[PDB]
Amino acid sequence: HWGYGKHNGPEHWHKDFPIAKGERQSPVDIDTHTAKYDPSLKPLSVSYDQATSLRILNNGAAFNVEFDDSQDKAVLKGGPLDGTYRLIQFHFHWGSLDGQGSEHTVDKKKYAAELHLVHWNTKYGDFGKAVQQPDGLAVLGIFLKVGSAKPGLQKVVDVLDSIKTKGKSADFTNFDPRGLLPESLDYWTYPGSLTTPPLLECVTWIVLKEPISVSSEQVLKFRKLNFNGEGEPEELMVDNWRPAQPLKNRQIKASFK
Ligand SMILES: [Zn+2]
Numbered sequence: 001h002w003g004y005g006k007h008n009g010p011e012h013w014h015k016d017f018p019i020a021k022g023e024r025q026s027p028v029d030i031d032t033h034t035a036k037y038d039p040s041l042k043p044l045s046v047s048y049d050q051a052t053s054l055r056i057l058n059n060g061a062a063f064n065v066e067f068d069d070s071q072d073k074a075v076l077k078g079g080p081l082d083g084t085y086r087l088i089q090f091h092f093h094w095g096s097l098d099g100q101g102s103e104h105t106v107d108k109k110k111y112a113a114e115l116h117l118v119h120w121n122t123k124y125g126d127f128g129k130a131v132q133q134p135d136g137l138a139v140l141g142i143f144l145k146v147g148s149a150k151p152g153l154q155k156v157v158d159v160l161d162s163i164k165t166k167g168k169s170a171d172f173t174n175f176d177p178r179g180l181l182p183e184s185l186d187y188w189t190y191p192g193s194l195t196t197p198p199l200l201e202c203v204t205w206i207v208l209k210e211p212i213s214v215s216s217e218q219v220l221k222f223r224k225l226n227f228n229g230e231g232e233p234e235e236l237m238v239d240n241w242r243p244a245q246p247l248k249n250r251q252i253k254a255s256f257k
Helices: 008-015 149-161 214-221
Strands: 045-046 053-058 064-067 074-077 085-094 113-121 139-145 169-171 186-191 202-210 212-214
Touching: 008 169, 053 113, 053 149, 074 113, 074 212, 085 139, 085 214, 149 169
Parallel strands: 139 202, 139 212
Antiparallel strands: 045 074, 053 064, 053 169, 064 085, 074 085, 085 113, 113 139, 186 202
């Protein structure tokens, strides 16, 4: 099955998922000089104060922190978006080394990791319906660089010991995702896809310009997770990122000058 090894990694995915070679695949390199400021873009509205986190899961590709998405408790609106998008989960992609790990790049620069807050368009009623629509999902992407610790990340880091292997989960209530944001909400946006199979072309990407800083110790703990299940040969969960894909017939817009 698909993964991030030499034998089943991103360069192989097209055989099972031909949309991998589609017209709006993600991630992409963000060429900052080519993106254009769009004065018609609105500020992002990130309304997370009523978010209800539930659980943290190792799914064999990353770990997801899942939220109650049965009501409009944590929603993304504004920016390039038409309508209301509910937070369902967040997860990260990261590297084996601090100089790689992000999926998007900025003028070809790779960050140590990238956080994805995944939201679905409530007009489609459920996530499974939303992913079948060109405007079904909105993903907020945030780069991580290594420097000072991110205080609001530590609760996530500290629970990882308990979800080491694929299939493990733990309670993860009362977590506030506002603690994972940078100061500025300036962003780039473009139409794209899921970055894991099934690679569906259903995402409005909103990638924040300002990275968050996390400490070396925080990211080192991500790298102790396992892709494998319990009792199987250990394969460290590292380099779980898809490389940049061709931009094709797309323009990246900036919310800032
Ligand atoms: Zn992701």
